[PDB]
């Protein structure tokens, strides 16, 4: 209704005297360290409950229908998971059985330490691509070939399959151990704010570039062209040119099979997405298409007739645990860091989505610990990095998923696919597995249609998307993440270095002050000029603040004094011989400041001293208490600049100025 | 006096309707580019006035008394300049005759393009150290030695003086051209805000730690010990160990000579600063110490008797211009960048000190062009990077200096120091010139006494000082600047990622709201909780903003909704069989926000939606106009979240709630 107040004009001290402050909390380092370490059993119960979340949902089961739902969803997601694992095994330059291994052990590990319920832990295209890239970097093909075979002219230095793939698997296991150690370090130290720097446009551009690189790699695999695995700067462009110049060295059968399975998978996926209300359970297009491919590839001997590319290297068994070859972490520190960061980011995103969808929440540090333990356990059994694929976890949620027991049931499908079945997948074409990932790339390729939407929004975030996407294509993929985080931090610094200062004026017959560049009928006090400066002053925006003041007052506080001293000598010589007209006061409406960066309070005091020489009083309007407490310690309230110069509100300063000019002419 | 107002409670729209905005300025890309390029003759006279500042002070000279002081000061700083010029040449691993060139040619260029009047352009101890750091790297001593001399057992691969130091000059000259071009790029592209990132604690800790490297490097010349010029990580630490283990390989004559001039020059320096009011012109202690040292070294043949280290390599002449050996700029990109920044930083810092004292100002972008052309012109005559020494410019100012003509007169003293005199400095000991620089290091060594002062002030700035000082000691000196700029910018991101949120409450019988953790007798509205959050929300502090609200309301907006639906099933089953108590509204006092980072504004719409399900209204208090315009474009004002939810002031949000609960029970 009515907004009426009547209080005296408390500037800084008329309000500080009769208002008693609170006693600050004493440090008591000994007492603080003693009070932190609790001795009661309740804290132990709480930490053992939050560290092993299985003790919460397991005793509270609802077996009646949850058992059947988890059984069917686990069968479905286990088929999908073993398919995705045997497909992504090619992305890591490792044999196919290690994909089935990586689809089994992380699921078992994410059962007693996991805190989610709709997450299918396993392989991931981006993470597998990064692992394969670093494996090719630290173990190329030209470093294992042995000259043997009695060639035509020189030594027959053909391919040396065998110990080569073993070395690749060992390198991948060491990388996964390092990633798990880094994740466990991040979880134990409770540092979870390191992943907050991955903005949505940053991760979007990163996923787009990773999808482009995955498409290039899978096109290389489908076309069956021998590439020199170029890595470094412009590696994707180099390998694309190398593929385009070696098109003649392809396989027609593999090409047409890949095209057919691509179009079939895409059509069935879009049909299922369109007519979702017709059938609740999505049809496993990948399972039926790979079964049909294996069937048509077993009848006709495509390996001998058309010389197609099949696996024919599935051992169909388990492997004893192998100790990781520690000692190569020096050349994999940054790679493991980037891999762990992107894996945790994508996993937390998927978990938060499927948790807000199903009305629950997940913890960050617990997810970090669970993923670290899963990667450590997978590193001991020759597996690659484990994450959650949005396409794989979508099947488990659509078929109906209540808890991770469906994941444990999915591990039985991978179990039977390791021990007994799996030799039936011998004649399966490698181009078929290399195509289902491309069919799954449709989700990340559609993110390019969101760049025009971000441009209509804050343009600073739209540049981060394009910058991260382009930079993660030129200078590889692992350096693209570091080039995006630093660019995002630089953009944040630029938004606080070049603020949006205004010409704050008065509204008639009221007390609220609005900008003069946004409203027409606003008048300012006679002689007084109000200025608002957001983005609190630090060592970078000090010159910007000086320029803003000089532009809002019309002149320069230094040049006016220079002209005054130049004109004073003309008068000082006549005794022996024979600009700042409108500006009366400056009310700085520093209400959007948080810190002051004492290097900046020095410039503030310098401004106050300079404007005092030209008879221009500089006042303050909305300084917070946390800033005044810093200014008191930084040596600002001397015998000249007292607290009366500061004010509580913007209208109080104008009222004080009016009363002063009315009572003191 | 009295502060009384009476206005209706305009929330967002009751003030937007009857207040007409202003028409935004049209882009007019065709007209904006045409309006920028001026065609009037006054614009051409303006750009030529600032580019050549000599056309301002030279026609307006005051030869009546200015020319007299320039002559006495020019000879004063000229004798001190030719000494520091030849002494700092040892820091650049260049011969001593090329140091005199760096004190003559840059002065001629800083006469028609310079914008200062109390700056003595020439060598610098810190800058010459960075130049000599890259000369030893790309041209070490172990890369020019030739096996010749018929040694005892192996080939006599002794020192190869001659083409060795001759190649060092060409390498040093190419560096200055690249440094000069980079300074012209910043001046040409008008980008001058790149040097604003060098805070005072950053440049303070850098020059302090650089003084340690100068002390260790010059101690090598004083003790006359052969060092293996270790560079890279822990370079200063490694070279300090080699000197201490090779103390026996010293020169007693060079030791007692350097230790004597250290205590002599330092004592007279502090004695002159103490009794400053006794004599206006400071006595040239550095000039009287080198003439006496040369006299005693000329009488007694210290070169032959005591095997002392003398120069004996002064050609005493000029050299034709040499074209820069272009092609090594690839290995000097990071090297020239670090030198070009510290050259401009120290120049403007020293220039601004003597500018405010003598009542004048210097241009920022002009110093880039001024020092840019000087470094390019000096690169064509075999010189190193030119800057201004605080010790050298103090002599020119104390003796009385009005303009750069005193510097031009000093160039005549350097002129005669090349053509006629200079051979008299043949028996001058190298330890004497290596000690006059150490005596001047007292100014930067005293900066360590400012670390405790910064600790009582903002502690974030005190950590940047110690970090830059330590990091510029471990990983060399050029990487220390980059490691400090990134750490300083990272500290700004940390201060805006973890803000200082409070518990804003109401003051009795008034309208001002203060924090609850800073005042004792403050009451809050019944049910309403006010929260203030500085450091505007972006992709990093979005999770912290969630935890901030959850900490001030007592619960979590998601966990309460999880418990509600967990409890509603108990009620929904009884029909077929047979927390958020205090929180009424939330007023977010977002008055310290500048940008929104739409990535983060998605959470603001989520927060309003989350608390809406638990019957908790989330309002806003002090949202600025520049911020609300971002929400309109980013898709925030939908059919549910209207503008009435926002308010103009904090008290209007409370008045709207109090009037609502009374009229609507």
Numbering used by the authors:
A (entry chain A), B (entry chain B): 18 to 595, 651 to 737
List sentences from the manuscript.
Encoded by the gene SLC26A4, pendrin belongs to the solute carrier 26 (SLC26) family.
Similarly, the pendrin sample in the anion pair of Cl−/I− (1:3) (pendrin-Cl/I) was prepared and used for structure determination. Symmetric inward-open and asymmetric homodimers were observed with approximate percentage of 75 and 25%, respectively. The symmetric inward-open conformation most likely represents the energetically favorite state, existing in the single binding-anion condition, Cl− for instance.
